Amino acid sequence: NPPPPETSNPNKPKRQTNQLQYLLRVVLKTLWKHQFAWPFQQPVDAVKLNLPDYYKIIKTPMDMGTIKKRLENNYYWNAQECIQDFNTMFTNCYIYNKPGDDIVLMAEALEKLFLQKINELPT
Ligand SMILES: CCc1nnc2ccc(N[C@H](CO)Cc3c[nH]c4ccccc34)nn12
Ligand code: NA
């Protein structure tokens, strides 16, 4: 396993915005409770899960546990930055697997719910 993505970085400029608060309170917390959220709630542990090539293939890992901690720690500058992390997480699943896999069906359902939730954001 490589080290997980950082959730603090003291030199990085941080912001709190209404959209970032919404991404935590509404978007993240809704997706977290979905019946398909559990594979995505923590960094992939390639040793535990017996995926020895996971990090041979996935070079920008991301997961909702990391995203949640980034939001809680005010790590982001803007909502787009956090949205990019969600997109990376979904894309990584599609890259490491293939169409029709159970894990891909999960990611697809979560991605559709995510898009539904970010279709309209606060101002
Ligand atoms: C983000 C996690 C992730 N990304 N690519 C993958 C590829 C395999 C994988 N194995 C899961 C580890 O818990 C267990 C599992 C085996 N078949 C499944 C079908 C649906 C849901 C889980 C599984 N996890 N994985
Ligand atoms: Na919304």
Numbering used by the authors: 44 to 166
Text taken from the publication that reported this structure:
BRD4 contains two tandem bromodomains (BD1 and BD2) that recognize acetylated lysine for epigenetic reading, and these bromodomains are promising therapeutic targets for treating various diseases, including cancers. BD1 has four α helices (αZ, αA, αB, and αC) as the skeletal backbone, and they are linked with three loops named the ZA, AB, and BC loops. The Kac and inhibitor binding site (ligand binding site) of BD1 is formed by ZA and BC loops, and most interacting residues reside on those loops (yellow and magenta in Fig. 1a,b; the key residues are illustrated as sticks). We characterized the binding modes by determining the crystal structures of BD1 in complex with four selected inhibitors.
Furthermore, changes from methyl to ethyl at R1 and methanol addition at the C2 position in the N-methylpropan-1-amine linker showed decreased blocking efficiency compared to that of 5. The N1 nitrogen atom of the triazole of the core scaffold forms hydrogen bonds with Asn140. Two hydrophobic interactions between the core scaffold and Leu94 and the core scaffold and Tyr139 are common features in 5, 6, and 12. Another common feature of the compound 5-, 6-, 12-BD1 complex is that the indole group contacts Trp81, Asp145, and Ile146 through hydrophobic interactions. On the other hand, there are also differences between the three complex structures for adapting conformational selection; the indole group of 12 is more bent and does not form hydrophobic interactions with Pro82. The hydroxyl group in 12 adopted an additional water molecule (W2-1, W2-3, and W5)-mediated interaction for ligand binding. The 12-BD1 complex provides insight for drug design because the ethyl moiety of R1 was bent deep inside the cavity due to its hydrophobicity.
